[PDB]
């Protein structure tokens, strides 16, 4: 937060926190404009956010401004899952139990995705997304 907002500018709340601390949809990290720009400009290099080695991508970042990254992961994961499972049957005929259960199943992957317990079911959730994406293509 006020003590971790970048590899470079970790303390940025009182350093005019107007510059953008982007999460790469694959970084989930607080990267001040200096480092994140430095990175995607050269390209997908890691954001050195506190020993980090995860590739701060090229210009594919999203916006997450300090939204409790446990939520930012929980928010970024749910939308893609809710997009991968976009409308797998939820209003095909108007059912409320199955749709909500399918909904109760829908974000249960996201809750698992936001958790990633011992991951072997999150991988199973990914195969469902590929199955959901394969079903979407057809």
């Amino acid at each position: 937060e006020n003590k971790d907002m970048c590899p470079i500018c970790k303390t940025d709340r009182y350093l005019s926190p107007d510059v953008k601390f982007l999460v790469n949809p694959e970084c989930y990290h607080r990267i001040c404009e200096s480092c994140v720009d430095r990175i995607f400009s050269l390209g997908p290099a890691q954001c050195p956010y506190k020993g980090c080695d995860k590739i701060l991508r090229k210009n594919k970042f999203k916006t997450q401004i300090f939204d409790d990254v446990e939520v930012e992961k929980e928010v970024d994961i749910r939308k893609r899952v809710f997009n991968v499972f976009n409308k797998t049957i939820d209003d095909f005929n108007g059912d409320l139990v199955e749709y909500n259960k399918y909904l109760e199943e829908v974000e249960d992957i996201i809750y698992k995705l936001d958790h990633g317990i011992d991951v072997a079911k999150t991988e199973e959730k990914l195969r469902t997304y590929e199955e959901l994406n394969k079903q979407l293509i057809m």
Binding site: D68, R78, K79, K101
Partner: protein, 754 residues
């Protein structure tokens, strides 16, 4: 005395009577025969409560239909006031009739001021007391107690002795005024709380505050036995919309937002810990979801129900499963996502106001959480916590604040309004945004009781105009009848002090600040009033921040030392224990020798329920007119609604409210027709709002008494106090205005049947 309404023997508690009481008996009984509302402004100069209780007590025990009576005074000071008087009438009625009571009537306020469990009761805030008793007497904690005889679940043992003898029967016979109820229940070591709540199904008449009728969070236990064919009275019903808008509005601060994260993690901890030990229960409530909203153990809860329904009592709720939310990890991941979309609208840079839907859409824009699952948050959290059976709520306090908001904004539309103030302009440019959310139509809250109840009465000493209420509240009336004060004497002085000695118009509308002309002018008027009025004098600033600024620099000048030579000075502090310690010492000094001066805020707590008798009030004052656009645009928004939904302008609404509380303050110094005292008005605008005052006040405010300088005000009240100090008791002109005992009513009025 026992006359007739041509059908109703009336055991009026006093052998004497008053004329306006009888016209009230006439028109209320005229209102009780035909289903109507008939707002009846009863000037507090007479005893409206005595006239109210004597006839309805007659009506219900004369007629066989209206078995239940309801009487909603604003505050709990007025609750016991009705309780003690009903007790006196009841005794007097027995004193003439014998034993024809078969009557139970109990007041109904709360746990904290009724909890006889000391440790529970020694606490201060409402929350811990009630919750102590809960963990102390919980249908789970008790289960934790009898199933596991152990030290962990205490019980009040008042709840238990409630449970033993009391929940078969009732308290012996009394109309237990709060003084009487507690003593008995403390003598019977009975929790008068768990007692009185369970004889709601048994009391003939019930006395409770507006919140329990209007605040839906506590208006859930509504039982049709007290409700169905019952007869309803609204006493002191001018502050109805404010209580309604109060009972439906909501706030948020980034700091409270921080608290929810802790609970959300603490839930993310609390959900995680129960599920490892016992998730087979947590699934058990998942199928208890898929069948329905789980009413078997979310509403049928003796001591369990955790999160109340901030929404109206269960009208606008659907019964299905909350979409995704069936899962608790959903719910916490869902709650993990909702607490963060507020923080970004929290930090919204300036004031922005949204409708519940556009915000709901804008929410749906950033995150597609449907309105329908969103609406289910309140009871969804309530149950889980009890399935969590959590030990503490403090980590979860900011959690239920959000459940109230999400249910509200996802349910209501087109009557409410969001607004995003990112600061308080009184300390602007600091981190303290607020997510203000409030209602605009006060008809909404009253519509169900107007939809539910048939025979209702609206009665106050102050209601003016009696038509603003049918407009705002959107309801039908029959006898909107008020009565004038027919007196054989003057008995009070309303004055318009527009000018000071400098002949200078005065106000608090200029600022909430100092302008040594007006301030010293105000200081001069106060110090001379402190010289002239007898023991008991009160004043009413438009705003406390007006009081604080003006008073502080009044001690700066020598104005405070002089009144300290004459009288006692007793301030109104926000903490009311000090205020109470002030007020009783004001009344004590009023009943004692050295004069007592009580200075309060027109919009403050003292004006709501506290009375000023002969000695406790002589000369009320009103420095300027109470106005609120000192503060931000929330009134503008509702006023805009007041302007768009109703044909009500800015000034007409503001002057109505300003004179609504102006009228509310002036009438307390008077108790009966034998009471007197000065009600001076001190502002230029009071010259033009003489009509906005209630009739009985307006009848007393004459043309020559307009825009008076402060100087001839003192001469007028000087002769007033002298002449009033005389014992002007003809006892035959009082045959006109007292209508001597049972005859001048039976002689003259039974001649008046023309």
């Amino acid at each position: 005395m026992k006359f007739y309404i041509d059908d109703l023997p009336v055991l009026f508690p006093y052998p004497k009577i008053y004329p306006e009481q009888y016209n009230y008996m006439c028109d209320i009984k005229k209102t009780l025969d035909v289903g109507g509302n008939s707002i009846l402004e009863m000037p507090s100069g007479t005893g409206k409560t005595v006239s109210l209780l004597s006839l309805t007590i007659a009506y219900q025990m004369h007629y066989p239909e209206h078995r239940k009576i309801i009487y909603c005074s604003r505050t709990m000071s007025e609750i016991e006031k009705a309780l003690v008087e009903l007790e006196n009438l009841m005794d007097y009625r027995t004193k003439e009739l014998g034993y024809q009571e078969d009557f139970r009537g109990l007041g109904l306020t709360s746990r904290k001021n009724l909890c006889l469990h000391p440790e529970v009761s020694k606490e201060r805030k409402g929350t811990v007391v009630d919750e102590k008793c809960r963990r102390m007497t919980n249908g789970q904690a008790k289960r934790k107690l009898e199933e596991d005889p152990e030290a962990n679940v205490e019980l009040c043992e008042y709840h238990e002795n409630l449970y033993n003898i009391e929940v078969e029967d009732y308290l012996p016979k009394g109309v237990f005024s709060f003084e009487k109820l507690l003593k008995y229940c403390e003598e019977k070591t009975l929790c008068p709380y768990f007692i009185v709540r369970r004889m709601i199904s048994l009391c003939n008449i019930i006395i409770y505050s507006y919140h329990y009728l209007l605040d839906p969070k506590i208006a859930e236990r509504v039982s049709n036995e007290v409700s169905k064919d019952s007869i309803v009275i609204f006493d002191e019903a001018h502050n109805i919309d404010n209580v309604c808008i109060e009972s439906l509005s909501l706030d948020l601060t980034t700091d409270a937002l921080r608290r929810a994260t802790r609970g959300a993690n603490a839930l993310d901890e609390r959900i995680s810990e129960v599920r490892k030990v016992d998730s087979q229960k947590l699934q058990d409530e998942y199928e208890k979801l898929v069948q329905g909203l789980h009413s078997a153990d979310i509403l049928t809860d003796q001591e369990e129900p955790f999160v109340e329904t901030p929404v109206l009592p269960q009208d606008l709720l659907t019964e299905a499963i909350p979409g995704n939310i069936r899962r608790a990890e959903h719910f916490v991941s869902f709650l993990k996502r909702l607490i963060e979309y507020l923080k970004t609208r929290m930090k919204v840079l300036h004031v922005i106001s949204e409708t519940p839907k556009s915000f709901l859409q804008h929410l749906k824009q950033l995150t597609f959480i449907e309105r329908k699952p969103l609406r289910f948050c309140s009871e969804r959290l309530s149950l889980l916590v009890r399935t969590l059976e959590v030990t503490e709520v403090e980590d979860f306090t900011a959690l239920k604040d959000i459940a109230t908001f999400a249910t509200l904004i996802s349910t209501y539309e087109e009557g409410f309004l969001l607004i995003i103030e990112p600061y308080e302009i009184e300390n602007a440019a600091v981190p303290n945004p607020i997510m203000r959310f409030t209602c605009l139509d006060a008809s909404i809250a009253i519509k169900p009781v107007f939809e539910r109840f048939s025979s209702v009465i609206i009665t106050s000493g102050t209601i003016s105009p009696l038509d603003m209420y049918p407009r705002m509240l959107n309801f039908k009336t029959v006898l909107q009848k008020s009565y004038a004060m027919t007196l054989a004497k003057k008995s009070f002085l309303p004055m318009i002090i527009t000018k000071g000695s400098d002949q200078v118009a005065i106000s608090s509308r200029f600022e909430i600040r100092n302008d040594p002309s007006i301030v010293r002018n105000y200081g001069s008027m106060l110090v001379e009033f402190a010289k002239i009025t007898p023991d008991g004098m009160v004043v009413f600033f438009p705003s406390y921040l007006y009081m604080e600024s003006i008073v502080s620099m009044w001690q700066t000048m020598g104005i405070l030392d002089e009144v300290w030579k004459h009288k006692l000075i007793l301030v109104e502090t926000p903490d009311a224990q000090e205020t109470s310690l002030a007020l009783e010492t004001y009344r004590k000094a009023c009943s004692n020798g050295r004069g007592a001066i009580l200075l309060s805020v027109a919009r403050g707590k003292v004006s709501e329920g506290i009375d000023f008798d002969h000695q406790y009030g002589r000369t009320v004052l009103m420095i300027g007119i109470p106005f609120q656009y000192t503060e931000s645009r929330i009134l503008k928004a509702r006023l805009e609604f007041m302007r768009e939904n109703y044909r009500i302008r800015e000034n007409d609404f503001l002057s109505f409210d300003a004179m609504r509380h102006a009228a509310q303050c002036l009438g307390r110094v008077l108790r009966g027709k034998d009471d007197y005292g000065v009600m001076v008005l001190a502002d230029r605008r009071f010259s033009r709002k003489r009509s906005q005052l209630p009739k009985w006040i307006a009848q007393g405010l004459s043309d020559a008494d307009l825009n008076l300088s402060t100087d001839m005000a003192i001469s007028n009240t000087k002769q007033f106090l002298r002449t009033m100090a005389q014992p002007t008791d003809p006892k035959d002109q009082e045959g006109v205005s007292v209508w001597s005992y049972e005859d001048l009513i039976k002689h003259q009025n039974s001649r008046k049947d023309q």
